[PDB]
């Protein structure tokens, strides 16, 4: 599909900034079950479409009023760089639509009616933001529920091509406070697909 691509590429350097901002996920092992599984070896999230993806938040100290959280893909070859992510042909017009989420974005936020989503003007990139919150009582870090939805094999979308999820913790103008970041597969069984990669790596 002829799309316009973008005229520039988000930062996607690791920053830990002034509150120690850095992302964690659940470990949550290789069982055919799993539905959301993060590899460290390859700093890679396997998720299938739809299904929620716990995303946490870690803070050495809290950051200020009106901090916000925004999550944004990018294709992760650098011939891709500048090609907006963006759901494939059949997902952008399937109404599968939650009445909150643009029905053409990657990436939507579950469970919280706060979320607001943004077609940029200029980038032409989407994004998905939320308030920070600090952690909930009885809780050391903050967590985010993510939704992928589209499969990383989606023809005329992703189209095979690896994805990145870029995380900034920002100021209320949007200005970045820290930033970290994930490459992403979107597919059927995503613990196997995430034993068969890590099995077959070089032990060293
Ligand atoms: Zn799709």
Known sequence: PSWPLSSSVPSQKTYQGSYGFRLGFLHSGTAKSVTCTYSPALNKMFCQLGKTCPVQLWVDSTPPPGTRVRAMAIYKQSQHMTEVVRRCPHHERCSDSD??????????VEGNLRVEYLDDRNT????????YEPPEVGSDCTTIHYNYMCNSSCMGGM????????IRLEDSSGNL????????????????????????????
Do not use: M, W, Y
């Open 124 to 131: 032409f990139r989407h994004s998905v933001v939320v308030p």
């Open 99 to 108: 009445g909150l989420a643009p029905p053409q974005h990657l990436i939507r």
């Open 159 to 166: 189209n095979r091509r690896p994805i990145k999820t870029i």
């Open 177 to 204: 406070l820290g930033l970290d970041s994930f490459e992403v597969r979107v597919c059927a069984c995503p613990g196997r697909d995430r034993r068969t990669e890590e099995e077959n790596l070089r032990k060293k």
